[PDB]
Design a protein around this ligand. Structure first.
Ligand SMILES: NC(=O)c1ccc[n+]([C@@H]2O[C@H](COP(=O)([O-])OP(=O)(O)OC[C@H]3O[C@@H](n4cnc5c(N)ncnc54)[C@H](O)[C@@H]3O)[C@@H](O)[C@H]2O)c1
Ligand SMILES: NC(=O)c1ccc[n+]([C@@H]2O[C@H](COP(=O)([O-])OP(=O)(O)OC[C@H]3O[C@@H](n4cnc5c(N)ncnc54)[C@H](O)[C@@H]3O)[C@@H](O)[C@H]2O)c1
Ligand SMILES: [Mg+2]
Ligand SMILES: [Mg+2]
Lengths: 585, 531
């Protein structure tokens, strides 16, 4: 009894697990349990072997036991009552099937027996009839349904499943030869056969099995359990880890939890607080600097060592101010601590300029760490979500398997998640919208009214759209209508830090203060938190200058020219003109 | 055998219906002939005949294709054509190393869809542009400024000594505004700015005076009209603001419209049907009239939406454009930079309306998509009401942005269900996203909706939107609640209520069925049991 390298992988990376009914899910075989109650035991048991059903004449047990009858529907009703399909299940199998479904593995029953027997078992395990592959008895039916009785089954059923669903790794779990057949018959069959000899062993079928087990807690305990590490500890990082921590605490209250209960959070050490910050977080479950008054749960564990935070981690969340991200990825690469099977997601907004082009955080993680990286982008001002005000976000998945994991991790009753395939569109919207929020706040600082502010947003959204098409034409218009697009741009233009600081900057510039800078105000206003829109403005302007697109994006350009003092703030609604106008003295 | 003094009425009509006008260069566009590589065209604006620059601009302003047909030298004429914004391809002329003009006009008739073509010139070559072919000019206007040649003048359908005479017979539109509320007045103020500017030149596309129908109310209307005409200001709906000196108010709907070549409809939408029936019955709106609607809101017809532009077309028998954008009236009235879309019935009208509405502080974008821009303008007010409800609950910016995201989403979905022709690009225009944002943070529907929800939650459930409209709005009308009711009738007819859970939640909140606090939980609220 023991597994094997790439088999264990297939079990852990499974997209669907198919269970045989008779003697893998049920303690007793159906045909015989039905023989008793029907008093034909030995007539049956004289059919249930290999001197009869070992070659037979032209029939197997199921097909033949059916032939034996003068038997009526009210009888099948009775029997299912005498043996309620909850008394019939091998211990540990309900817990195993529940665990699989809880992490999005689809579960099938595939049986060579009677449908009328498998469906109550399916109903009990929460498996839909849609997922039960099993022939019915031949019933005469009439004009509603059911007065009186009138090879390669499992490999073929697996072939149909494979053509119907986006599943690539499909496992067969069973005791008989029909189950072994599920893999051996045809190449599009099961990718692995696990033989369950908990009820009946069967040395000949166990021998060609990919894995032989006696208990289901043998399978359960080889289910992957993801350890989660949050890389970052700012305002949004902490309210994020707080939501993520609530999910794992929920998942660990059930047997086959897909997540470790404890979430690790890397906290960058700052000179003015040193080690005391980390210790405060672990003792009081609060980041009192970046998210004061908010209880990160009791299952959040802070550490200041980046390598140690990451080493055990199966699920990495990247959420740090974007100017730091390149250095953070370079450190993790050098340490060789990120296994290539690790799932990553980025919550970060901002980009690096590379080869005269945009590199978003998710592209940075993939290129440098060699792993796939999803994103979570939405209208998400942290402080309010930390207080559990209703909010929403898009998760754009690198591939569909990731999406399911991330959604289970991040979705809370106050934080609704929408899965999208468009990672380049979500991510570029999340990043570019902070430029527009700077423009929006320069507007506010000027005093402009709702009509004019709406113009800045309209033009901003239209240029986000255009830039997305200039750089990744795959991007779908639909994406701008989701939470990562128009929702985020609005919340950030009316309630974000970029708007807030840019308003103050523009008020001061107008009043004569020609020396005030965004860097100074960031220090003065944001209490350690990081301004992202002006950095993003410069990053994009670098790309615009390089590609000669300064006039293709007039609002982006006049916002940068205003930040850097070539155009006066008052020209913000005059972008069509301010983008090309000669600089001021 | 004298010069044709006044043209013959057929000729007059042909002038106004011209698709293209062809000018001779020598002695009709320029005062001189030629004479004198190198290429020292020393001037080219001192060459010009008075009025011709004004005339050619006035023709272009009317969509008339202008050409140069010269028996002289091309390199000599290109500079003229450039100054006059006539592309090189519209200059028919020889280089430097006979039926020439009628031959050139035959080409034009083959390469363009122009059927009415007029020749303007001084010489015999210009006369032959009409006479020398059954496919030549349809009329010949002889220009006797510079050179008076009686042989050419005796022939020719029209003789003039000054281009002023031609410019006076160009089509000229008389504009009346149907409506006199806040937005109609600030609209009228902009329009009158444009006609006053245009009327400073000889061949103005617009008559200077703009007429405004001011509906008479029982409370204050016997001298309203007189106050407006003498003080140039609507003190009830737009106090403090100078409508132009060229705005004339009347309370007679039919006579306001009787003279009018260009109609602007901008009255609260609940009265537009009636207004349309009356003008139809008075038989005062001719099939030639140009119409544009600024009204947001709909009428339910055949349990489908009828938007105001459709109402105008069906009932008055004319095409109707629309102007839609993020246009809170008070700020535009004060000349704060703003933007709008004009979705045009046809490109020709779109051009006319842009000349009328566009101001240095009010930029216009032309768009072919009328059903999209108009349905956005109408649906936006529903979401604004939901936004105001969230505001009255103290909902934060994440949460309000969800209302707007779901709102915009349902706007786009309803648009496509009703009019599959609507292009996605339309929602990114000022009529879509911009207007929904402006009105969700700064509009009347947001404000009243806010006051309403504040009072509800604070325990007053006798308060009504009608009450608040009366108390808060000073005569002005609340379009968001009416439009929510209109859409909801359509939703209930087509079984769409759950297809649009935010719309449904908003309507159920407005009436007593769902508590205001459920606004962020619309997905569940749309179908939850009442109370
Ligand atoms: N705050 C929000 O409401 C919000 C919402 C959505 C997305 N975001 C995005 O999340 C990302 C991070 O935001 P945040 O709110 O978690 O951070 P933050 O703005 O709160 O910044 C504070 C963090 O900066 C860290 N820091 C300071 N110097 C550092 C250094 N040299 N190296 C590494 N870290 C350093 C500090 O450890 C601190 O934790 C940003 O890209 C932001 O655009 C923020
Ligand atoms: N106010 C804005 O900022 C704004 C901006 C853009 C679009 N709009 C839309 O354009 C229209 C604007 O209307 P408004 O702002 O010009 O008007 P308003 O709401 O300011 O005033 C109400 C008007 O209703 C008139 N009226 C006509 N027939 C009437 C009748 N039988 N009974 C009572 N009153 C009658 C009254 O004379 C009065 O002038 C609306 O459809 C609106 O949705 C308004
Ligand atoms: Mg079996
Ligand atoms: Mg001549």
């Amino acid at each position: 009894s023991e597994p094997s390298e790439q088999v264990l992988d297939l079990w852990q990376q499974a997209d669907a697990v198919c269970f045989d009914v008779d003697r893998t899910v049920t303690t007793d075989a159906s045909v015989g349990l039905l023989a008793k109650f029907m008093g034909i035991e030995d007539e049956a048991q004289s059919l249930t072997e290999q001197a009869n059903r070992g070659e037979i004449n032209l029939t197997k047990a199921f097909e033949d036991r059916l032939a034996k009858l003068n038997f009526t529907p009210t009888d099948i009703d009775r029997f299912l009552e005498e043996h309620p399909a909850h008394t019939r299940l091998v211990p540990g199998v309900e817990n195993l099937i529940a665990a699989l479904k809880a992490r999005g593995v689809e579960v099938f029953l595939i049986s060579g027996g009677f449908r009328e027997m498998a469906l109550p078992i399916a109903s009990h395990l929460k498996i839909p009839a849609k997922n039960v592959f099993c022939n019915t008895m031949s019933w005469q039916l009439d004009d509603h349904g059911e007065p009186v009785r009138l090879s390669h089954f499992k490999s073929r059923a697996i072939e149909r499943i494979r053509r119907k669903y986006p599943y690539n790794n499909i496992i067969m779990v069973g005791d008989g030869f029909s189950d072994l057949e599920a893999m051996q018959g045809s190449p599009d069959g099961a990718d692995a056969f696990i033989c369950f000899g908990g009820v009946m062993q069967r040395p000949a079928v166990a021998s060609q099995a990919d894995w032989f087990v006696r208990s289901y807690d043998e399978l359960m305990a080889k289910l992957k359990r993801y350890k989660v590490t949050m890389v970052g500890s700012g305002a949004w990082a902490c309210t994020a880890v707080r939501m993520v921590a609530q999910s794992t605490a929920e998942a660990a209250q059930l047997p086959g939890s897909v997540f470790e209960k404890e979430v690790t959070m890397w906290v960058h050490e700052e000179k003015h607080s040193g080690r005391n910050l980390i210790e405060y977080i672990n003792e009081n479950h609060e980041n009192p600097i970046y998210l004061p008054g908010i209880d990160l749960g009791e299952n959040v564990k802070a550490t200041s060592d980046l390598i140690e935070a990451v080493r055990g981690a199966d699920a990495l969340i990247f959420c740090a101010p974007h100017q730091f991200m390149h250095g953070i990825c370079k450190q993790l690469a050098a340490a060789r601590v990120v296994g290539r099977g690790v799932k990553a997601i980025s919550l970060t907004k901002g980009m690096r300029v590379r080869a005269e082009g945009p590199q978003l955080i998710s592209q940075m993680v993939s290129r440098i760490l060699g792993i796939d990286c999803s994103v979570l982008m939405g209208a998400n001002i942290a402080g309010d979500i930390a207080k559990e005000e209703l909010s929403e976000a898009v998760i754009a998945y690198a591939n569909r398997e990731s999406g399911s994991l991330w959604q289970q991790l991040f979705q809370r009753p106050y934080f609704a998640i929408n899965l999208l395939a468009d990672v380049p569109g979500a991510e570029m919207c999340g990043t570019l919208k902070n430029i527009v929020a700077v423009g929006a706040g320069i507007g506010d600082g000027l005093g402009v009214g709702p009509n004019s502010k709406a113009s800045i947003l309209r033009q901003g959204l239209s240029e986000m759209r255009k830039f997305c098409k200039f750089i990744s034409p795959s991007v779908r218009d639909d994406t701008f209508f989701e939470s990562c697009g128009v929702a985020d741009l609005i919340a950030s233009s009316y309630g974000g830090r970029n708007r807030r600081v840019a308003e103050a900057w523009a008020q001061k510039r107008i009043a004569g203060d020609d020396q005030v800078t965004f860097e100074k105000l960031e220090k003065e206003m944001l209490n350690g938190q990081k301004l992202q829109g002006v950095l993003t403005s410069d990053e994009v302007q670098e790309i615009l200058h390089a590609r000669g697109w300064e006039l293709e994006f007039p609002l982006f350009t006049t916002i940068n020219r205003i930040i850097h003092g070539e155009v006066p703030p008052t020209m913000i609604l005059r972008y069509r003109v301010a983008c090309s106008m000669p600089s001021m003295p």
